Amino acid sequence: STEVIAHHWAFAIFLIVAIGLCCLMLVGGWFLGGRARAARLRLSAKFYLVAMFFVIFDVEALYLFAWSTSIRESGWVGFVEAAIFIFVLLAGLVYLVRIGALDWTP
Amino acid sequence: MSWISPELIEILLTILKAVVILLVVVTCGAFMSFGERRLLGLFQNRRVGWGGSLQLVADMIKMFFKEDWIPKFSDRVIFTLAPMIAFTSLLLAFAIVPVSPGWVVADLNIGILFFLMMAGLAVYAVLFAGWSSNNKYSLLGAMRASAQTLSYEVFLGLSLMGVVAQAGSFNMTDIVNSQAHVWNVIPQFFGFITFAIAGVAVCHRHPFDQPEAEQELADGYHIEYSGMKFGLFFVGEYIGIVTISALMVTLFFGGWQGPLLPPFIWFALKTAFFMMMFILIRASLPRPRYDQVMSFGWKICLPLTLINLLVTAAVILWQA
Amino acid sequence: NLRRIMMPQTWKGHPLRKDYPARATEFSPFELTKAKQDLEMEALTFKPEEWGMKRGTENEDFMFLNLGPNHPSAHGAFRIVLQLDGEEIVDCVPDIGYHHRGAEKMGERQSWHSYIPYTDRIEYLGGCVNEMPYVLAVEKLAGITVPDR
Amino acid sequence: MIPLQHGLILAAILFVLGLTGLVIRRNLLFMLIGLEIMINASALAFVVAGSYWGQTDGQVMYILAISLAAAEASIGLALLLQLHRRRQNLNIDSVSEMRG
Amino acid sequence: MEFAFYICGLIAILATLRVITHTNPVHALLYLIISLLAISGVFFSLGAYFAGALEIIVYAGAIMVLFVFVVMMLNLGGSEIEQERQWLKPQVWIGPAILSAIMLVVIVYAILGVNDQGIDGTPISAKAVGITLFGPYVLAVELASMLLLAGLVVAFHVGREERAGEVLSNRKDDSA
Amino acid sequence: MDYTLTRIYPLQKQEIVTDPLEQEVNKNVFMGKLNDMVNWGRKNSIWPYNFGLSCCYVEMVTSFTLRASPRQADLMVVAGTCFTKMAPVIQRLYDQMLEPKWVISMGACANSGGMYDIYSVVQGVDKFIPVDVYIPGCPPRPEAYMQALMLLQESIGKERRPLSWVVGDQGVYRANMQSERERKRGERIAVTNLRTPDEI
Numbered sequence A: 001s002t003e004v005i006a007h008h009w010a011f012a013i014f015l016i017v018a019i020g021l022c023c024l025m026l027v028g029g030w031f032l033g034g035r036a037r038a039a040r041l042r043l044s045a046k047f048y049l050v051a052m053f054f055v056i057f058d059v060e061a062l063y064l065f066a067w068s069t070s071i072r073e074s075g076w077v078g079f080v081e082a083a084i085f086i087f088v089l090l091a092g093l094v095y096l097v098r099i100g101a102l103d104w105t106p
Numbered sequence B: 001m002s003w004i005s006p007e008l009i010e011i012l013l014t015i016l017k018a019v020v021i022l023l024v025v026v027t028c029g030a031f032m033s034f035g036e037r038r039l040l041g042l043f044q045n046r047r048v049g050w051g052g053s054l055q056l057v058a059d060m061i062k063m064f065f066k067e068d069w070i071p072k073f074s075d076r077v078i079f080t081l082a083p084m085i086a087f088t089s090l091l092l093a094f095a096i097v098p099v100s101p102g103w104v105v106a107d108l109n110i111g112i113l114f115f116l117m118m119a120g121l122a123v124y125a126v127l128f129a130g131w132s133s134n135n136k137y138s139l140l141g142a143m144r145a146s147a148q149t150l151s152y153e154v155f156l157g158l159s160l161m162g163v164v165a166q167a168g169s170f171n172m173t174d175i176v177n178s179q180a181h182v183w184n185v186i187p188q189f190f191g192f193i194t195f196a197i198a199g200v201a202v203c204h205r206h207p208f209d210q211p212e213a214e215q216e217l218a219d220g221y222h223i224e225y226s227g228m229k230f231g232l233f234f235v236g237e238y239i240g241i242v243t244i245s246a247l248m249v250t251l252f253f254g255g256w257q258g259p260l261l262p263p264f265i266w267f268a269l270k271t272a273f274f275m276m277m278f279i280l281i282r283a284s285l286p287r288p289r290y291d292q293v294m295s296f297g298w299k300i301c302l303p304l305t306l307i308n309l310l311v312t313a314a315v316i317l318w319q320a
Numbered sequence C: 001n002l003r004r005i006m007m008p009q010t011w012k013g014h015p016l017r018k019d020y021p022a023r024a025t026e027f028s029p030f031e032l033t034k035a036k037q038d039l040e041m042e043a044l045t046f047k048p049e050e051w052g053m054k055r056g057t058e059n060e061d062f063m064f065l066n067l068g069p070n071h072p073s074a075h076g077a078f079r080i081v082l083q084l085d086g087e088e089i090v091d092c093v094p095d096i097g098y099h100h101r102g103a104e105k106m107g108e109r110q111s112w113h114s115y116i117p118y119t120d121r122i123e124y125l126g127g128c129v130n131e132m133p134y135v136l137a138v139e140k141l142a143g144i145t146v147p148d149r
Numbered sequence D: 001m002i003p004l005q006h007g008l009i010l011a012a013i014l015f016v017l018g019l020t021g022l023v024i025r026r027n028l029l030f031m032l033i034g035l036e037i038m039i040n041a042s043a044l045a046f047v048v049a050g051s052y053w054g055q056t057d058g059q060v061m062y063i064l065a066i067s068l069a070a071a072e073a074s075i076g077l078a079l080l081l082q083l084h085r086r087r088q089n090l091n092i093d094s095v096s097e098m099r100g
Numbered sequence E: 001m002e003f004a005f006y007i008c009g010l011i012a013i014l015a016t017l018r019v020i021t022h023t024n025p026v027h028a029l030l031y032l033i034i035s036l037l038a039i040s041g042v043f044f045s046l047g048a049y050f051a052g053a054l055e056i057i058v059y060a061g062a063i064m065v066l067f068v069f070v071v072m073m074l075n076l077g078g079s080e081i082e083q084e085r086q087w088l089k090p091q092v093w094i095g096p097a098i099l100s101a102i103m104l105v106v107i108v109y110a111i112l113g114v115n116d117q118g119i120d121g122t123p124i125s126a127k128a129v130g131i132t133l134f135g136p137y138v139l140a141v142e143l144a145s146m147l148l149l150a151g152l153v154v155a156f157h158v159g160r161e162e163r164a165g166e167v168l169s170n171r172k173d174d175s176a
Numbered sequence F: 001m002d003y004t005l006t007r008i009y010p011l012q013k014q015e016i017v018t019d020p021l022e023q024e025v026n027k028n029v030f031m032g033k034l035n036d037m038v039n040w041g042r043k044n045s046i047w048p049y050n051f052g053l054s055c056c057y058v059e060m061v062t063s064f065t066l067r068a069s070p071r072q073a074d075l076m077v078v079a080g081t082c083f084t085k086m087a088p089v090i091q092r093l094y095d096q097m098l099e100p101k102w103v104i105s106m107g108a109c110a111n112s113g114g115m116y117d118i119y120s121v122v123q124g125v126d127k128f129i130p131v132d133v134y135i136p137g138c139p140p141r142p143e144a145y146m147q148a149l150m151l152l153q154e155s156i157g158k159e160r161r162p163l164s165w166v167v168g169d170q171g172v173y174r175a176n177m178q179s180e181r182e183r184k185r186g187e188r189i190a191v192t193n194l195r196t197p198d199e200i
Ligand code: SF4
Pocket: C121, F053, F054, F055, F056, F079, F080, F081, F106, F107, F108, F109, F110, F114, F137, F138, F139, F140
């Protein structure tokens, strides 16, 4: 249908214009206007752990996203399976909170 | 009109409508920046143009004609890319928002998944800004803000899984058509609350702004940015608020479904209410401690989103 | 550690001495240039001992907490040299003298009456509270007992 | 239509490039980065195969693959942190005490 | 579809080469993200809409974020290794490159001899994948949770800090 | 209106010139409209960086009732005494700002050293930093800063700075405005009687 072809072109133009608009504003800032002639330390792994926890939970959420779009088709069996999955996720979350791995302040 | 064909005009009118949506969104975000500043002043009991409306235009001219500057010891590519990501992340996510019947840039099957894809890439703006700045203190602030975001980006999608479950689809139009009778604000209330909390956190708006307040060794990932590059982050935030607001309308408030006013008017009406709801929130909300925001995202919102989805599934399968 | 506290460490001469000129000398761009460089090279040319501090378990980070327009609370703008072990303070040395206006030297260039304006500028938030101790002391020198009103 | 062979060759090129990266780089970070290219290339091949056969199994295998990549990168970067915290050096050639 | 497959397929190979040969760690990760976005386009061109999104949501929006976090945390880059640029020295990469080239040649030969009716591109939806995940592949999803749990437990055990404080000093053997 | 050309601080090119735009050779109605638009945006978007020194900063915060980075600031308000140890700091902060930039000296001290002509004070910030507006007072009333900002807006609306750094004349033409003292001499001298210093 011409509708899907039209929407394909519209999406492409929107993306090209959006990124083009940002570049235009940036290149304008660079050109428009005058200009004057003119190791020992590290961050705590608490930053990594938050990111690592995010990665693990985000990958776990992928399965729940696929289930969400197909809950009725999967039926109650699927519900029981997802329930076990969510329980394991919550159990690990409880472990992280109880071991204090989820408290920014010491 | 010789080359013009009934099909060509369809593939031309559609492109025009998409450009219109893009322009209106960027305009709305910029205007809100001004509209807010003024309203906040009214709340605090305190002009360039019509009610100060031209202040927005004045700022743009100043930022455009301001000397552009990249720190001598800063990765130019990463330093320049950060503002770009901040501006062209949630803006691209608006392609899935159906503003009215016959007005949607992209009716994608992935639907809401596209917003999550763009929201996921937005974190790099904060990280790249901090690393490129070359300011040790900026890096710490960027890392604090990035960790805060991931603590809210974790349940962002899960907050919308109850809506997807009821609709049985990620397509936004299907989600709107599924709110014909009852808007998802009522059945998926916990989802609405959690999504709102995550959405403002993703847009780095109050109270998830200033994540470097407690640390004296942290400054901010915008300290070295100046001129348009500094403005791109500011505008990006407001464009993101508009995108989130328009998603809430589409996901929890029936989208353009309203009793009498034209469909588009409803969409705007509701989106404006959400855009101003965030404004009421900014004034009437004390900023919690970095520790509190980190804990609230992992210990309260994440569990709740996981429970809402399971309960929604039980009710759906029971009614079937 | 007997080092200058109010004047730059490179300052030549002792200001409150009688033979020392009180009024300001001609501005020298060169000195500002050099002063600016020394400031830019401070981190490279930092020695803890110069500030009275000693390196200990090592890896300890010496840092300069600037408390000016970054954290301004009408307290003024100064800096504290912080020796840290992570976020804990092992030792700190407040660097002062950045707001020295030679008020005590001015007392020797102003009459007992023409100095009153300067008293109020020792603690700006106090106003008349700063001139009370001065007028009362001058009145003791004059032998004056002020009326009840 | 895309030739199945073209898709499989794309994956093979990205796999061999990732392996070359893992062997020529002494930095543990670039070695971990090279492994991500290799596992992504293997996941791409499953998607190409599943698409040729019109089966969801290709995407199901991709999900299992990205799950391992997430878990492997998590543990991998944790060991990199420990090595940096204790030896302040990411040259894998230095991690070669046990031999013979 | 054809343009998307070849253009994205090429953007990926070029970016991947820049990643393995780069000196700056963050730039290498940037080219790696670019290659992941290119592979996502290849997935979408083949009809794998679910895999497509996950390629940007989990690989370029989570796994890569973690990598950048580590590079920014340990201030990586400018190390003697990345200054010596040994990998660029021909005597260091010629041998590895030849082994990889021969492996590619042998693999490509096997691929060129396979039946190829062509990939149509009919979109396989996330709903279909979810029915499979919570249907025939149920044990996989349940055991995948245990795999990610193992990653969480191990990464916490070896990744946790013994010294408190957001900013820490690099000491030999992390002496406290 | 005559202009002072700062082509490409105590010593620098300061040639008195005529309106560069009015000059016929470089006279373009479009170019003039562009200059006015830029001047309008800059005068109506002066983001400030208040360097807090001594007691004047306290009066400034009363007026306030922030571009924490000099990079995002268009105006540096020097409010306080220019102490010897502080002078290098002031110069560095001003040198960390981008064009166009303006400086308002608030207070007798920042203006000329004020009552502090002592060994530890620079007699005026205009000894090392170019100043655009001087605010007399000690401390100047909060409302006085507002008048200074309005005076700067007027001066900014008359400037002829390069519209682009790649084409045209890269010279900053600042208008030689009429002194406020002469402008309001008439009303001031006309004053006859004032309230007796006896009532509140
Ligand atoms: S001018 Fe007067 S009030 Fe202002 S800082 Fe100097 S002494 Fe204080």
